[PDB]
């Protein structure tokens, strides 16, 4: 039974799992799983647990809290101070990190600050398989110059670079160890799918707070008084612009969202900006959920990507909003996207070479 360590800026305990949490759920099923949280913070409710191991759903969690963390100042002239701060951070891992590294068979570094600990991992445990999970491009996160360089530096020495999107590969300075392993879905999405939460009529759903654009709903609700818009986990309340045909929900647990997704007529990824990476079309978790069911989606043009059943609009552009919805209403529901479950996904994250279709560069 292999022992796993996940390094990330998430904490495993934060409600509303991201991709890394779902992977970590799978790791916990396979072996001793540790999850070692790095870097107003979402993790503040956990502050009284800082610097101690807490067990959560079978995972050993640690929220490392230093006085200051290294970060991108976004000031070219402050760059030697940054590098100094990152080097310092990197040079003072807590004993607990070091111990967990020693104990691991596999260390997973999520894209971001975790990069600063790859060299450390190799010194502490050269036998550990080093898996980098590129949940995001470094440039999108806008990491400090130090993290980019360090990543370019260490990237070839990683055992696995598991990119959520092949579109991530251009900015990854390595080849032989770069694989494509997109997000999984819950193995029982279709079982969670229902009973239906909706009565008669036309229902559209949006889930998640990422770049949440209320203006989408302001326009859409007015233009489609016959569509009921279910806005879940927007991170926001009832925008005063919403028509009465918008229902605003608090944060819902993933499982409870599923019925609202399966039984909608179309879904919506209402990102307020198109200043988004090209890979977001692949890496969007909500879009994936919609895609699993063949639910037509309305989303900005920037995240349609290479996908059928996605109707682009320009945020801020009422007409394009209307036009995309008009098409999403008439789109047939077809499961175009192949969606591996989280377990099958975690299998390729960990051993992509055993699944040679994941290779992004010429095979051995």
Swiss-Prot record:
Its EC number is 2.4.1.264. UDP-alpha-D-glucuronate binds at residues 209-210, 251-252, 271, 285-289. It comes from the Bacteria. It is a peripheral membrane protein. Keywords: Carbohydrate metabolism, Cell inner membrane, Cell membrane, Glycosyltransferase, Membrane, Transferase. GO terms for cellular component: plasma membrane. SUPFAM superfamilies: UDP-Glycosyltransferase/glycogen phosphorylase. Changing residue 271 to A: 14-fold decrease in catalytic efficiency. 25% of wild-type xanthan production. Disruption phenotype: Cells lacking this gene accumulate Man-alpha-1,3-Glc-beta-1,4-Glc-PP-polyisoprenyl, are unable to produce GlcA-Man-Glc(2)-PP-Pol, and show a decrease in xanthan production of more than 95%. Its main location: membrane. The active site is at residue 136. GO terms for molecular function: glucuronosyltransferase activity. GO terms for biological process: polysaccharide biosynthetic process. Changing residue 213 to A: No effect on both substrate affinity and catalytic activity. It is an enzyme of class 2 (transferase). Catalyzes the transfer of a glucuronic acid (GlcA) residue from UDP-glucuronate to mannose-alpha-1,3-glucose-beta-1,4-glucose-P-P-polyisoprenyl to form the lipid-linked tetrasaccharide GlcA-Man-Glc(2)-PP-Pol, with a glucuronic acid-beta-mannose linkage. Is involved in the biosynthesis of the exopolysaccharide xanthan, since it catalyzes the fourth glycosylation step in the assembly of the pentasaccharide-P-P-polyisoprenyl repeating unit of xanthan. Is unable to use the trisaccharide acceptor freed from the pyrophosphate lipid moiety. Belongs to the glycosyltransferase 70 family. This is UDP-glucuronate:glycolipid 2-beta-glucuronosyltransferase. The lineage of its organism: Bacteria, Pseudomonadati, Pseudomonadota, Gammaproteobacteria, Lysobacterales.
């Amino acid at each position: 039974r292999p022992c796993y360590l996940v390094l990330s800026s998430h904490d495993f305990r934060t409600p509303r799992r991201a991709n890394i949490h779902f992977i970590t759920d799978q790791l916990a099923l396979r072996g001793t799983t540790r999850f070692f949280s790095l870097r107003g913070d979402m993790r503040l409710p956990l502050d009284d647990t800082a610097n101690t191991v807490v067990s959560h759903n079978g995972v050993d969690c640690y929220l490392w809290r230093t006085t200051v963390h290294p970060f991108n100042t976004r000031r070219s002239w402050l760059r030697p101070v940054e590098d100094a701060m990152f080097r310092w951070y990197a040079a003072h891992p807590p004993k607990q990190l070091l111990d967990w590294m020693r104990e691991s068979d596999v260390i997973v570094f999520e894209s971001g600050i975790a990069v600063a600990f790859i060299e450390l991992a190799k010194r502490v445990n050269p036998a550990a398989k080093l898996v980098y999970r590129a949940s995001a491009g470094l440039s999108t996160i806008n990491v400090a110059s130090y993290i980019e360089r360090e990543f370019d530096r260490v990237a070839p020495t990683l055992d696995v670079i598991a990119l959520v999107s092949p579109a991530m590969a251009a900015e990854v300075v390595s080849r032989d160890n770069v694989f494509h392993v997109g997000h999984g879905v819950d193995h029982n999405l279709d079982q969670l799918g229902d009973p239906s939460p909706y009565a008669e009529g036309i229902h559209a759903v949006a889930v998640g707070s990422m770049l949440f654009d209320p203006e989408f709903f302001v326009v859409a609700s007015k233009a489609f008084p016959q569509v009921t818009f279910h806005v879940i986990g927007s991170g926001m309340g009832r925008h005063p612009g919403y028509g009465d045909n918008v229902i605003v929900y608090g944060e819902m647990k993933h499982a409870q969202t599923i019925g609202y997704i399966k039984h909608a007529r179309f879904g919506i990824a209402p990102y307020a900006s198109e200043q988004v990476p090209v890979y977001l079309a692949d890496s969007s978790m909500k879009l994936l959920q919609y895609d699993f069911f063949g639910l037509p989606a309305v989303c900005p043009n920037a995240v349609v990507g290479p996908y059928k059943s996605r109707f682009g609009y320009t945020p801020g552009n009422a007409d394009s909003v209307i036009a995309a919805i008009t098409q999403a209403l008439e789109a047939p529901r077809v499961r175009y996207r192949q969606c591996l479950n989280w377990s099958d996904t975690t299998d390729r994250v960990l051993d992509p070479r055993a699944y040679p279709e994941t290779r992004l560069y010429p095979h051995p």
